[PDB]
Symmetry: D3
Amino acid sequence: AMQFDVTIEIPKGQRNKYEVDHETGRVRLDRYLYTPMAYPTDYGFIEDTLGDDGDPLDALVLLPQPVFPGVLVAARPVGMFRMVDEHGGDDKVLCVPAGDPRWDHVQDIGDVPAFELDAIKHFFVHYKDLEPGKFVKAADWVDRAEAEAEVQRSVERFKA
Amino acid sequence: AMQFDVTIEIPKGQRNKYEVDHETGRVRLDRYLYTPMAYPTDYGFIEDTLGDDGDPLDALVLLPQPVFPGVLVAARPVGMFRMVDEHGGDDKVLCVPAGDPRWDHVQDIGDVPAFELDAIKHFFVHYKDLEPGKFVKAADWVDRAEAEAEVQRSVERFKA
Amino acid sequence: AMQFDVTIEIPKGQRNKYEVDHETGRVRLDRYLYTPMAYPTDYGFIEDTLGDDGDPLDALVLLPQPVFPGVLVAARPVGMFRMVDEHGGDDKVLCVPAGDPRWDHVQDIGDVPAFELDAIKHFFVHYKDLEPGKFVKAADWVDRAEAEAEVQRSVERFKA
Amino acid sequence: AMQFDVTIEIPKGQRNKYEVDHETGRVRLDRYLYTPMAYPTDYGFIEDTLGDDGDPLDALVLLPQPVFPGVLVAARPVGMFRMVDEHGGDDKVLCVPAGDPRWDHVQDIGDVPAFELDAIKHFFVHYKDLEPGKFVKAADWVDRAEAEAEVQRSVERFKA
Amino acid sequence: AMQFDVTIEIPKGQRNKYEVDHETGRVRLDRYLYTPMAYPTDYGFIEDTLGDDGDPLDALVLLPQPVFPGVLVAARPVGMFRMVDEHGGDDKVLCVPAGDPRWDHVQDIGDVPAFELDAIKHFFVHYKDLEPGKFVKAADWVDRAEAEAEVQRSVERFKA
Amino acid sequence: AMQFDVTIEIPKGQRNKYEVDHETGRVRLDRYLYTPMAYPTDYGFIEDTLGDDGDPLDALVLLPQPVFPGVLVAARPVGMFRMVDEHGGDDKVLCVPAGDPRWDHVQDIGDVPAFELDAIKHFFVHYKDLEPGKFVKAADWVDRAEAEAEVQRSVERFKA
Ligand SMILES: [Ca+2]
Ligand SMILES: [Ca+2]
Ligand SMILES: [Ca+2]
Ligand SMILES: [Ca+2]
Ligand SMILES: [Ca+2]
Ligand SMILES: [Ca+2]
Ligand SMILES: [Ca+2]
Ligand SMILES: [Ca+2]
Ligand SMILES: [Ca+2]
Ligand SMILES: [Ca+2]
Ligand SMILES: [Ca+2]
Ligand SMILES: [Ca+2]
Ligand SMILES: [Ca+2]
Ligand SMILES: [Ca+2]
Ligand SMILES: [Ca+2]
Ligand SMILES: [Ca+2]
Ligand SMILES: [Ca+2]
Ligand SMILES: [Ca+2]
Ligand SMILES: [Ca+2]
Ligand SMILES: [Ca+2]
Ligand SMILES: [Ca+2]
Ligand SMILES: [Ca+2]
């Protein structure tokens, strides 16, 4: 099975939007969110990846307890969240911890309760509502097969 | 200068929706919110008040640090959030601590930063989205005079 | 589905062993635990039940986020943990929140992942290791049907 | 050997000064402290005591982990903090948990390390500096025997 | 408008005095404070500056929520805290987040409310009372223009 | 008097088992513990050491307040915990902060309360009980002199 390293930027429950600067590796506070919302899962990116824009592929990791900003978590993808915003398409891979039997029951997007997926969607649809010149036009969920394909595309781009 | 006691049910930052049961006085968990949202201010109700809803008049309190559920805070009103939900009008009186000179610069709704009023509005408009058969329609932020009048109304209703 | 109110005494992750006095209703610190352990679920008792020993029926509640000591939670039973300690038979009903569709997938003890049942068991087996004259000696899980029967017996004992 | 119940109003590390209303038993926020200081121990009062000033006798409880506001702790005195402020006399009994063998090495005021006693002193001397028309002009520690004498006086006054 | 990157060493509310080692970039615990006090704002230093003692120029950042130690925050100066301690002169630039319109109402030292500036002064005046070989002699606030002059000097020294 | 730098990987009270990768210096989540236990002291390793295993020598640090993962603490040894798990044998040096006179009363293993030593032992004996292929076979406390020998040992092997 496919797996990889995710670097968590923002723990679950945070209104502080942290981002890891990729030139340096330093954790930065981008902004305090303008909406009364908090990240529904631990949020970050996959190491040694690169998307269409000059940034790694975004990742969401389900956990029994949050980590801190800058922490690595070995994860495997079970699905992916597509969305369109002010800078076009944005993909977010949904993962669980790799080599952990406690998450073996989650092999695909259908194994994650509809209510956690709706809550995730709702966050990304609404979190920038009060920010000038920022919107989220579309949003929906694809399966693990489509997620793994997107990871494979992003690894290939990185190595090039 | 009008003042009253507010009982805080939900501290700022909470996704657990607590409620005081008014007949018994116990704190209950009503529900964990279905949306990835957190109460932007300390939320509760004014003691010895009564609306058309058989319940007390709801209240928001601006604080430097949150209290915990069940705590009493002496407060004075600076405005009111007017909204309609699935059960009609649900007005919420915005307050600051009474007799505290660090809040003397806040006398009316205009003295509260718009960004904070925006975020409070965004919470109540969106926190119930994912709950079926539930919705909110924000009317407007109204001034201190409109608030004090509603508080006075609901105090008279209580005394009966 | 059968349901009832649970008063939570100890939130998940606490080494402080809080207890409610059943006359006064006050929260008391019985003791700081002598072992490096923490309650793996929110822990308390079912309101208006009378067990075989004069005390109410104990309860464990699975939640997405812990509450505080003294909080009421409407819960439905999915199983029961039977064990013996230094004062004989000790039974603890495992529950989920009642009227919450996010827990509809948990209808009996087999739906609760074994890792969580093993952990709960491990807590109670070991938490009084370092207290003299205190132990727990038997332990095993019984299904929803037996839990509901035990709750019903305890509801009646209380009424009489 | 003397012991009693201490009700904790304020946990260690708190800048919010909570208070129990002794008529109703409700927890109130008196005020957010005006200085950048935090209570160095859990703070509260002794149940069934009445001091010379109409209120219950104040108490500091040394703990391995803090409790929450409103929690009872069975405790025994090991000393007292004698203080004169703007309202005159103010005596606070320093306690440890009763019947807990992890505190049996603490028998009198000399057994509490001087760094802790100085820190506590430093709190009460400076926490109201920035509060107007508020001060403390005398601050001294006394032994268990003197502390126990004051508790006894206060207990007997409670029985009027 | 002048701006720079501040690295936060100590979040607001902390009694642990964290310090970044400027050679390696590692975070160190210098000491647990000897007074019962907590840093009243997020505290750190300005990146790519050089104070005339060989360290980066110290910075205080006003935030709606604290960050973690090591986190970068883009900021702009609004004033400066001038103090004289056991090391002689010690300057600390008071800042707000740069490119954040929620802080546009704070442009110079007079825009910060007095109760917050007094609290910050109170911290630095008193936090080393109980520390041996450490004392304060004086503390004053100066305006944005004085602060900017000091930043600019420290920047040129950095380039040398 | 021997002293060294300890990097804390895991703060006290944690169920998340973090690790520093000694190649990269990145913090990684190894695993969420399968037992309902939490690290009773801050846990990590000694910098510039090499144990029998090929990783650095492990360290426990007694603190008045926990740090966060990746923080350096100057520390001196007062004893050592010897254990035999799967993977050979593991040793953990028990320390206190160096140059801190609040810990001067702790010079050898006899000076640490037995209650704290039993709790630390109890953690490392039981924390992997439910993990397959993991175990403990023996657990002992040894004195300062024994610990200092093992540190110096590990320093030499790092240099060689
Ligand atoms: Ca990302
Ligand atoms: Ca992205
Ligand atoms: Ca985006
Ligand atoms: Ca309410
Ligand atoms: Ca209402
Ligand atoms: Ca409503
Ligand atoms: Ca809805
Ligand atoms: Ca119980
Ligand atoms: Ca029982
Ligand atoms: Ca028992
Ligand atoms: Ca035992
Ligand atoms: Ca008191
Ligand atoms: Ca008093
Ligand atoms: Ca007083
Ligand atoms: Ca004063
Ligand atoms: Ca600094
Ligand atoms: Ca300086
Ligand atoms: Ca200094
Ligand atoms: Ca000093
Ligand atoms: Ca280690
Ligand atoms: Ca090792
Ligand atoms: Ca090992």
